[PDB]
Amino acid sequence: GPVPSRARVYTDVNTHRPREYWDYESHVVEWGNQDDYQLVRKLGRGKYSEVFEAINITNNEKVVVKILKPVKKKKIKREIKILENLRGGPNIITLADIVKDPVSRTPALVFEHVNNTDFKQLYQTLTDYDIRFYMYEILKALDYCHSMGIMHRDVKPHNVMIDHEHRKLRLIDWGLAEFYHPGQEYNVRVASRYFKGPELLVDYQMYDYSLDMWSLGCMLASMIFRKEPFFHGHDNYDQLVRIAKVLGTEDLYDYIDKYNIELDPRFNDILGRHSRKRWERFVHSENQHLVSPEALDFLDKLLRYDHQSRLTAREAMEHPYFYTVVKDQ
């Protein structure tokens, strides 16, 4: 069978807490009054929810409402619990209330309101310094949630929100997040394809917070190289080929060895044989101003098949890539 794995950091953090903290199945939900909020306009449709801008008529404060589509109550209790646990944390979205339509029986999450600067405007103006800063800001949120025994499992640009006018960032969409418990086997059918770690793709279920660090590298790549998505797999199998065509098949077979992982008979056809490529080959004139020795060192140390050899969030925050941003503090 597969070799076990535990987290190198924040391993026993949920164990040292009361059971209620992570036994979300037991959480009873504090309902608010739906008539305190009126919906203004729709902001987005999104697989598990629809998102609206609303006003709280109690204090005339602008708000965000995610009306949920039908999920199991235990997954809602999960998200609510994780949000409540992380509330007040750096760059974590703030849950403000929870309400149910007394007729449709549909439940709705009410959030603080953050203006998103227009994608086009932001993307075209970004700058290396800006990327550094906002990555630092994402790392802050991740080290916080990891320290609080929680893995997001859906880190990607969709779930990051930036108000550039106020240099303000939030990490959202906590509905796939789970509590890390050593020895636990998780579902590998999580996150979107382009951001899935190797461990999900080879079906190693004793994963941990380091899953987030892979995605974060997947994010950094697309930004510095200006290629979204960076690993563009046609299906879950081809996603690992895309990764192997860059990272090389050798470190991959070394990883499945160390963890005595059994590859579906399929991959053993498509994976083939692939040298580990150098980053220079994704550099061109239009991205060079984002790419730097510091950045490629940072990226290399996140994009590793072996989850145990990835940088932790706190080590990442200590990386030379962010030396300038930390001095502003």
Ligand X SMILES: O=S(=O)(c1ccc2nc(Cl)sc2c1)N1CCC2(CC1)CC(NCc1ccc(-c3ccccc3)c(Cl)c1)C2
Binding residues for ATP, as ranges, are 43-51, 66
Name the minimum Å distance from CB 223 to ligand X: 5
Name the minimum Å distance from CB 299 to ligand X: 13
Q: Integer distance in angstroms from the first to the last C-alpha of the chain? A: 48
Residues in the chain: 329
Q: Which is nearer to ligand X, 13 or 171 (CB)?
A: 171
What the block records as the tokens of 291 is 């790419």
Q: Which is nearer to ligand X, 145 or 162 (CB)?
A: 162
Q: Which is nearer to ligand X, 4 or 320 (CB)?
A: 320
Name the minimum Å distance from CB 139 to ligand X: 11
Name the minimum Å distance from CB 4 to ligand X: 34
170 Ramachandran zone, left/alpha/beta (phi>0; psi -120 to 50): beta
Q: Which is nearer to ligand X, 144 or 305 (CB)?
A: 144
What the block records as the tokens of 81 is 């619990």
Name the minimum Å distance from CB 220 to ligand X: 7
Q: Which of 97, 128, 143, 154 is catalytic?
A: 154
Q: Which is nearer to ligand X, 267 or 321 (CB)?
A: 321
Q: Which is nearer to ligand X, 162 or 240 (CB)?
A: 162
Residue nearest to ligand X (CB): 44
Q: What is the 3-state secondary structure (H, E, C) of the chain?
A: CCCCCCCCCCCCCCCCCCHHHCCHHHCCCCCCCHHHEEEEEEEEECCCEEEEEEEECCCCEEEEEEEECCCCHHHHHHHHHHHHHHCCCCCECCEEEEEECCCCCCEEEEECCCCCCCHHHHHHHCCHHHHHHHHHHHHHHHHHHHHCCEECCCCCHHHEEEEHHHCEEEECCCCCCEECCCCCCCCCCCCCHHHCCHHHHCCCCCCCCHHHHHHHHHHHHHHHHCCCCCCCCCCHHHHHHHHHHHHCHHHHHHHHHHCCCCCCCCHHHHCCCCCCCCHHHHCCCCCCCCCCHHHHHHHHCCCCCCHHHCCCHHHHCCCHHHHHHHHHC
Annotated active-site residue 154? The verdict is yes
Q: Footprint of ligand X on this chain (CB under 6 A)? A: 43-44, 51, 64, 93, 111, 116, 122-123, 131, 134-135, 157-158, 160-162, 172, 223
Residues 6+ apart with CB under 8 A from 195: 154, 155, 156, 214, 215, 218, 219, 229
Name the minimum Å distance from CB 109 to ligand X: 8
Kindly list the catalytic residues. 154
